[PDB]
């Protein structure tokens, strides 16, 4: 279970960074890189990840399917979205709220998405 698995990794994980009175998690599908039960991207049956696309245009939304929990090969569904800024966010909001897929990560996913799109604009 998530709670059992969190009790194994809360303070012992290759993704755990403790430094400068801070703590981060570098595993995939953690929306805030936060060593938190909520935002851990491995222990839950349903997780949401947002990454920049392979080329610096658009984001990739990763969703964990329900069936293959023990089958890493086919557990994550990756969708690339390369619309305008307001349309990219609208899709993520619907991908989470309409499906009721981890609704508590809605704004974290939207906030992370806005940060990737912003970083893909030309630097000044």
């Amino acid at each position: 279970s998530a709670h059992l698995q969190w009790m194994v990794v809360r303070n012992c994980s290759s993704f755990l960074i403790k430094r400068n009175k801070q703590t981060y998690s570098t595993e995939p599908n953690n929306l805030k890189a936060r060593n938190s039960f909520r935002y851990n991207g491995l222990i839950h049956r349903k997780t949401v990840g947002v990454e920049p696309a392979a080329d610096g245009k658009g984001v990739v939304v990763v969703m964990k399917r329900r069936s293959g929990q023990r089958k890493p090969a086919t557990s994550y569904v990756r969708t690339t979205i390369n619309k305008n800024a307001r349309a990219t966010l609208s899709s993520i909001r619907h991908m989470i709220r309409k499906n009721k897929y981890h609704p508590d990560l809605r704004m974290a996913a939207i906030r992370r998405a806005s940060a990737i799109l912003r970083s893909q604009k030309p630097v000044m």
């Binding site: 279970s1 998530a2 709670h3 059992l4």
Partner: protein, 53 residues
Amino acid sequence: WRKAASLKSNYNLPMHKMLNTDLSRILKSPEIQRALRAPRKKIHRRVLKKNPL
């Protein structure tokens, strides 16, 4: 659990102290949720005392 080890003279799997580790399913279940008092989530910060006189 049903069958003791065959290649160890006397051994069986260690018993579980907690059968259902899904703490979120337990807490959100109807049975527990009927026994709880309503949450008290209002925050009462300190009141600056003004002199009535």
